[PDB]
Amino acid sequence: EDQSREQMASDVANNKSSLEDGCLSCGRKNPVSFHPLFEGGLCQTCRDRFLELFYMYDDDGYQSYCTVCCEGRELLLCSNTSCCRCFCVECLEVLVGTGTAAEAKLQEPWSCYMCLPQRCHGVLRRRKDWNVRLQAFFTSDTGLEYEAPKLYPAIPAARRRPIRVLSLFDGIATGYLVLKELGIKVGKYVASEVCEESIAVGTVKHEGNIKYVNDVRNITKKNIEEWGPFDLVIGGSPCNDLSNVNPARKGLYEGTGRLFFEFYHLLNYSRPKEGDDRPFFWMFENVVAMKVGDKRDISRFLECNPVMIDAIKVSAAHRARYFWGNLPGMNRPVIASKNDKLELQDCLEYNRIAKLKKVQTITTKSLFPVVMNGKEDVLWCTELERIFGFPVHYTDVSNMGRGARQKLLGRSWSVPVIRHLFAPLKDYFACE
Amino acid sequence: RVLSLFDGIATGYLVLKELGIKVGKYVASEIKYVNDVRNITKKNIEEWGPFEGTGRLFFEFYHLLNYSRPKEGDDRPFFWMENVVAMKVGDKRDISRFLECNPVMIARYFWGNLWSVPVIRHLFAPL
Amino acid sequence: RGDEDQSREQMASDVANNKSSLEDGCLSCGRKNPVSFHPLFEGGLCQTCRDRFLELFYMYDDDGYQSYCTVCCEGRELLLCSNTSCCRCFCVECLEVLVGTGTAAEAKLQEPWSCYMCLPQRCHGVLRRRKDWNVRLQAFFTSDTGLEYEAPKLYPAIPAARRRPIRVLSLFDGIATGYLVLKELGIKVGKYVASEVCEESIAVGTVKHEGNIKYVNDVRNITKKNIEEWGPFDLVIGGSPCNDLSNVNPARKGLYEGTGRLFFEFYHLLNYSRPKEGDDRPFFWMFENVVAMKVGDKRDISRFLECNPVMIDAIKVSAAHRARYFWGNLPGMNRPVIASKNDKLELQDCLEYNRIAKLKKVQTITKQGKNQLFPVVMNGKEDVLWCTELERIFGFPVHYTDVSNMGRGARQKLLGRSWSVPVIRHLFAPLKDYFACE
Amino acid sequence: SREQMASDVANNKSSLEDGCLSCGRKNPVSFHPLFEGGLCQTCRDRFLELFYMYDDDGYQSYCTVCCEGRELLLCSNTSCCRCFCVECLEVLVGTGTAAEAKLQEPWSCYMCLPQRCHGVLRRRKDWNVRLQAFFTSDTGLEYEAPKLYPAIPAARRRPIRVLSLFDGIATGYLVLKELGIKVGKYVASEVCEESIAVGTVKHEGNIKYVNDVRNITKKNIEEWGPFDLVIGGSPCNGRLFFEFYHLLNYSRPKEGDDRPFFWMFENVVAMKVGDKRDISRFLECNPVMIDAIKVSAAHRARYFWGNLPGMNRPVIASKNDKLELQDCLEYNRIAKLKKVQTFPVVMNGKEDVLWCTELERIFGFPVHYTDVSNMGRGARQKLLGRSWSVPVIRHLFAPLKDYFACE
Amino acid sequence: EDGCLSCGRKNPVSFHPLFEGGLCQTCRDRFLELFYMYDDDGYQSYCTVCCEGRELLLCSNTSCCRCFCVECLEVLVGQRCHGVLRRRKDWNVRLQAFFTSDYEAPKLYPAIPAARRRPIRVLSLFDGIATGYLVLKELGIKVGKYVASEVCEESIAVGTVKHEGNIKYVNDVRNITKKNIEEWGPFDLVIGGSPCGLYEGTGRLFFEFYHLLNYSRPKEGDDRPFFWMFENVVAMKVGDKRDISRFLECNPVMIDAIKVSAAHRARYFWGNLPGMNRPVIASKNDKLELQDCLEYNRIAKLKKVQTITTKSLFPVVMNGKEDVLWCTELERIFGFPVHYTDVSNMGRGARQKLLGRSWSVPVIRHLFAPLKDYFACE
Amino acid sequence: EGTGRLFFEFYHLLGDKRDISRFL
Ligand SMILES: Nc1ncnc2c1ncn2[C@@H]1O[C@H](CSCC[C@H](N)C(=O)O)[C@@H](O)[C@H]1O
Ligand SMILES: Nc1ncnc2c1ncn2[C@@H]1O[C@H](CSCC[C@H](N)C(=O)O)[C@@H](O)[C@H]1O
Ligand SMILES: Nc1ncnc2c1ncn2[C@@H]1O[C@H](CSCC[C@H](N)C(=O)O)[C@@H](O)[C@H]1O
Ligand SMILES: [Zn+2]
Ligand SMILES: [Zn+2]
């Protein structure tokens, strides 16, 4: 019963059946979900395997596999600027028409069907609302629908107190950086960054206002009561454990992925006891490109469904991630601000021209992003900081170079994204 | 009532029966089998109340113990308690600090705030 | 030996019983006929010894100590002063023959050992420290040269309504220290033609200064036509890459051969750009070279330039020991060095938050153990200065060299061979009355 | 490799010009004056310094073909000091010629015997005049030609005033009155006591000697009268060039002065190419290459910077010349060679050496010029060896007769 | 006048050429030899009256060398009659006769030589640098054949290049045979000078020239002109001087070069030429003072110069420095043409070794003056 | 007085052997 796609394509081309009933690339009947790009259905296995590898990218700056099904065997890349979309050789001729595979390979330059104005090439009719329809896929599709978060009661303006933060895997102190950018008065902050390179950043730049502690491995229960009531628990675990960029690909239950459980343990301890009514919150952040099996696990352990704020809508780089938590308003409409840097041309030094408008994701490892005086060059550390919204020269401490000033900026959060997330907290704690 | 994980052949049930004590209701996930480990919610625990590496089972056991733990101020008898000796020292410290109690001995490693039939029989003697 | 060729023992014996003075005797050479006096002590010096003192006094080792004897010129075995703020090393042969027999053995065993420059002065044998050697060490260097040239002519005062911007041709520009200091005083720069060939030094000038520095190619490929295509220059700054003139390099080639030839390109283009006869426009120039250079070079460079250098040490305005010669006709190049309110005369003023400095001054920039690893401490742990603090020491604005992916080594090299902002600020300061201000 | 171009040109697939003569690298910049073909820029620069350098025995110290001496065969023919490169032979004419050349006795180089198409090493039919074209004008920069001074009337001609830095034995003084010009002053700057004796006794003390050059200040040049010709030649055995350039600026007429001023430098040809451009760039001129072999009986090639009127005219011998060694010899002495490089005579069937009075007539100075101050055989040779040559200098100084007073 | 000044013994045999008095036969013999030689410093070796002394006073007058003795004064002196040291009024022209007036060869000079005779045919031995050849050409007398017997290679070159090889060297004198003289004969002039005990060492050569006379004189019945000559230094034993005069059978003459030159050159002559005993008369083109035998801007500290030999206060000053004579300045002393020794690549040593032991051109020119009336003049 | 003194006088009135042979 493993029917192929040619029969379905022939049936729909004669107005005998619909595209929804069939898996858009698997060909199997009994669809479970749609395709955000093309009109049709997607099978359970296809949906499971394409939730994961959509947002992964290669070093050269193009998608790692097909934009249609899930797979890369022979790929023909679109050469249009500000577009890296790649297609599948098998996908083209079986749905749009015979002979298009060799014809496309000869025309220079090649433009993908998304670039050109929409035309129903065979059965590949693009959506006119795919821009607003892709978001609904990732936001909420899983089986269980957890209850809506409780809305804490309002507090009078004169009955507000300074917040007592407790950060984990603090990195270069991004939360502390945004907290005074909003205006909230921080009465206490307890980071637990163990990297001595990053520790020097927090002490010098914030004047020893971070009561630094060691790894989040030896903090005992009595410690979390010796330090008093905590009104916020930040945390972002390292994401170099389970990603399909490294072959090992150890799960969340092995290797460096067990640091998530430390956040849960500390959240249990810092949580107010039963019968207490102080405002309490939490948060999390991890790479979206994680296994589906563990994507639900983090949701179930924390009993919340992740959101997806897409950095492109606010910054000049592509990196989306999951933000669990019970913040009051973590599902609104993303809006940019006046003091933003939407295009890369605003994140460059003097006498340099930006060839692109947006830049592919940046990782620990570092072609034609900028040309000065008719000569190509690569981005500076002074330029990698304006992209994320960090103040310039932030990492210029402890005798650094390109070797380390790029690793720290690679696995850090985004100033505009968190600035968006922590906006509602101006009502429960001290302002000005 | 008793809640047990990794019942297996329900040797603990046989030990409890041989102890002369009666159990009102026993709930297990693998006798009253309900479903798999990953098919339990807060509402399910409330209805059933009151009462693959090693880390995969340890996380589920820790979550179950945290969910079944009594709220602050209660004085009801709530206790909990296994891993082989030959295993990574980092994981040993992980599961030692996570449970808020250092291991002692027994060749197995036993935690607890209280397979081998005699060990279970000796442990269930003071119940 | 000859009557002049005595030994130090006879001179010491003669001066012991008030039969002669230390003046007639060469303090270590021993010969007669003194030509000059020893700057630190009282006595006389000979030509064979004096010309060995004009070079070897200021050179330093990597570990942070004098390379030779503080007394004669020479190091066989040296006793370093254990006390800090003083890296003077004394000569074993110099000690026992002037203060008394057996002082060497007790000096090597007395812990900590304090050099005779540090202890309160007393007539230790014949090592009588001068009571005014601080002002007399300058006289050893500033004016003892050969031909006594005429005083430079002073330009007439210019009205403030006729002042115009400053056009600068900075041969061997480096990182544009002249541009940075020029507008700090408020002088408007209407043109600045750098001549650097290293690419990194162009990135700083293009980025930090908004591309107002018209760079050109190598100085060697500059013809007489370029010097007139680029308008009349009102200042010709220059400083040679003194890698072939300092005695520090054992494999040096000296003047007239090698890298030292580049002085004549400064000398060539200076005449090519100097105003001709009948031109009365204010023209100034300035050459700069290290003190540690052979007197054969120092006389020829002064003979061609027809001027005598000054000696401005960077210890009276900053927190580093750097001394250089300054040729030029800058108005007021001999006035004494006075610090300013917004200076950093100690090493503590040039540190980040939560850093503790042990010393009060540091030696020159560009085996170096337990002293180079101990110039600063934080959290009770040994540390070394930062590239951010090496810009405060010289007076450069913070984060000046944060361009073009420069690591630690590049920011160290382009900084250590540059000038010093307080010194060049002292030199350039009188120019405010000749050019357009604000 | 060498066989790459040889195989191609043999089959008429390419020409000899395309490849470096021995380097094997393509893209040549300059052509070989000797043979047909071109030279790579890497091989081009290395050929200037070693071409005219010779050995003590009287043979070249490098290859006649490329630049290299590892194994060389010396030409047995007299009046020819060219040694050929061993690997240059078999790769050009054919394998096995290296052994044959060494075995046959006597062996003559390919230059001596009349030109034959020996492989590809075909001697150029016009090599004689194309060697100068390589030397006289090949450097990149092309400075403007000097201005020509207006003619000086004979009624307004004045005695000459000379400033001979590094004077030596007053070679310049001897030629200026021999040509008939009236000397008004000759401010030498010699500091060798032996050489001062010759210039004073033989000229009745007409030289106003001074002390070392490194003690002369701008005030002395102001006191000593205005100069009209600044001679200069540095001891080749580079510091003293900048002293000549220093003093020339003091004595060069200032802007607005319209009096005839001439200068001239001199240096050997066996100097690095880098130094050659530096001297010309500072002086703003291009040099000439005058050889003494066309006016005397000895070999020496020396560059001549200056603004002298006519430094480019062809070299022509004079009637009062001694082109052969037999014309510079005493009685009962027989010459063996025709020229002597930079067993020279027989005496009753015994090989002897040129006398100090025979090395005297070769250079053009009057006989017994160096018989003062009790010099020995060694001293009289060293003063003559490092001096100039009268026929060469008299050729350069000849056009000056129309500018200053004569007789 | 009845006692010897330096000895005191009576019965004198001769008078004194400086002061009035007598001389014994012991002192006159010691006065003949010990008079004229000199020391390296340039002073008289002994006293001028007694010619003896271990320590003696040294004179310091300008251009003077006569040094007196210590005991010679207080014995007899204690210008006017100082004690008994009253100078003779004509000692200048008196001591010249004491040496001269000490028979001779055939006393009849034939004067038979007449017009249209053959030119000179002169034979020499140990010629050196062709001294006789140079003077003979200067007078104008044509020479048909000039033979020499020199052996030192360094001096053979000078005669060749400077005279275009007209001199035909043969060999050392020890190799010349009787047939060689006959083959090269006849001959009209036999010049000879021994290199400078007579019966031992290199001095044995004197009789070789005498034997050469025996193979060159005209035979019996041949009244053709024939002459000879001889030269020797004055520093010789008394018995040696009496032997040469005995063999040559002549009274030898005393000629000193001071009257014609600017150096102390007094040597001993023989011969049979006319007019040898005539007093020396100076010429208008003669160099008599050292101030003219010197190069440019060189002033002399003296007027005459002492005897000069192979071995080197020096008589000239340069630019305020105490300085010596040049090689080209020694030639003009002897009358030689300038640059006469600038051959064969030789320096101070060889040229000094040649000029020192050579004759004097003006001195030999005087002896050959009367020969112009016998042979082909001009 | 060796034989040379008498031999030289003998010739006038009328290596030793080599010169004696040449003497006659
Ligand atoms: N064992 C450990 N204990 C505490 N921090 C650790 C740790 N192992 C790694 N880290 C830190 O965790 C960080 C994760 S990158 C995330 C940093 C943070 N989200 C920010 O504001 O940038 C790394 O910088 C690393 O230094
Ligand atoms: N041929 C050349 N022409 C122009 N500049 C050169 C040069 N060769 C080297 N340089 C540059 O000249 C510099 C001399 S270091 C002196 C620069 C100056 N004192 C300052 O720092 O402000 C070197 O850094 C070198 O990069
Ligand atoms: N330091 C110095 N100052 C002046 N002259 C020097 C000198 N050093 C060397 N000389 C002279 O410079 C001369 C250069 S060799 C040229 C000699 C001269 N031109 C001639 O025709 O004979 C040497 O003879 C040497 O005597
Ligand atoms: Zn499918
Ligand atoms: Zn596909």
Ligand SMILES: [Zn+2]
């Ligand atoms: Zn596209």
Ligand SMILES: [Zn+2]
């Ligand atoms: Zn001394």
Ligand SMILES: [Zn+2]
């Ligand atoms: Zn010492």
Ligand SMILES: [Zn+2]
């Ligand atoms: Zn000290």
Ligand SMILES: [Zn+2]
């Ligand atoms: Zn080549």
Ligand SMILES: [Zn+2]
């Ligand atoms: Zn070769």
Ligand SMILES: [Zn+2]
């Ligand atoms: Zn040849």
Ligand SMILES: [Zn+2]
């Ligand atoms: Zn007597």
Ligand SMILES: [Zn+2]
């Ligand atoms: Zn006497």
Ligand SMILES: [Zn+2]
């Ligand atoms: Zn006298």
